[PDB]
Structures are given as C-alpha cells and as structure tokens.
C-alpha cells in the first residue's frame, strides 16, 4: 500500500509543483514589465528636467 501510495503522491507533487513553476514564471515577467514601464516613465521625466534646467 505504501508503494502505491508513494507513487500517487508523486503525481500530486508533480501537478502542484508544475503550477508553482508556472506561477513563478508569470510573476517574473510581471515584475520585468513593471520595471520596464517605470523605467520608461523615469526616462521621460529626466528629459523634462533637462529642458527646464536648460530654460532656467
């Protein structure tokens, strides 16, 4: 019984582990996009500061 029970647990671990792997990957790309979007906005803001400093 333990032998069969151990085998069944492996499938459960595989499915649960697979889900966690996919979830982590999505979170990884999500953080990249957030940083990318924030970086673009920061780049645009620096341009404005230079123009203002140049004007003054």
């Amino acid at each position: 019984y333990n032998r069969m029970r151990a085998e069944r647990e492996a499938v459960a671990r595989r499915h649960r582990s697979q889900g966690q792997e996919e979830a982590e990957k999505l979170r990884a790309t999500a953080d990249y996009e957030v940083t990318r979007t924030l970086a673009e906005a920061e780049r645009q803001g620096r341009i404005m500061r230079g123009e203002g400093d140049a004007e003054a």
Binding site: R8, E9, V11, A12, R14, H15, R16, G19
Partner: protein
C-alpha cells in the same frame, strides 16, 4: 475487488448426488477462478478497461472449472459489482486530483 454471480439450478440428480455442499463448493471454485484471472491483468486495466473483458473471462473460466465436476448448477449472469482501491491508498488517489485544481 467485489463481484456478484447470479445463477440457477438444473436437474437435481447431479446437484444432489455429485458433490457435497455444491453451493459452498462453487464458492470455493469461484475464488480460485477469480484469484487466477485477476493475477493476470494489471491494476490500472482492471479498474477501467479490463472490467468488461474480465466478466467474460471469469465467467468462462469459472464454467471450465466446474465442467469436470458435472454438477447441475447453471450460470445465469456474472455481474461485476466493485473494484474500489484499498482504503489506505484512497487518500492519495484524491489528492492527485486536488493537485490539478491547485495548479490551476
């Protein structure tokens, strides 16, 4: 595994004066046939696919087992009842399904 065997009787000259306790003797013969056949097939098959081919083999094998005996018992139907796994391992079987849901 659990099985149900529906049967009838025939001319009592055989049933009454062939073997002692024919009903019990048939039950012992049934166990030997059931044990032998199940031993040949695998667990996964017997639960889903093997079910139909087993009721055919066990019914045919059981008949062959009582052919030399010549008893007057006649087999009416061999209707398989249950193949649930051991209660000790049932816990893991359901968890494997829950893991798929947890994955989603």
């Amino acid at each position: 595994v659990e099985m149900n065997v529906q049967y009838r009787v025939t001319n009592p000259e055989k049933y009454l004066y062939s073997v002692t306790s024919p009903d019990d003797s048939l039950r012992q013969a049934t166990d030997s046939a059931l044990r032998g056949v199940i031993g040949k097939y695998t667990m996964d098959r017997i639960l889903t696919e093997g079910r139909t081919v087993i009721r055919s083999d066990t019914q045919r094998e059981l008949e062959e087992t009582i052919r030399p005996y010549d008893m007057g018992i006649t087999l009416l139907d061999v209707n398989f009842q249950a193949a649930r796994p051991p209660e000790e391992v049932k816990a893991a079987f359901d968890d494997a399904i829950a893991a798929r849901e947890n994955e989603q």
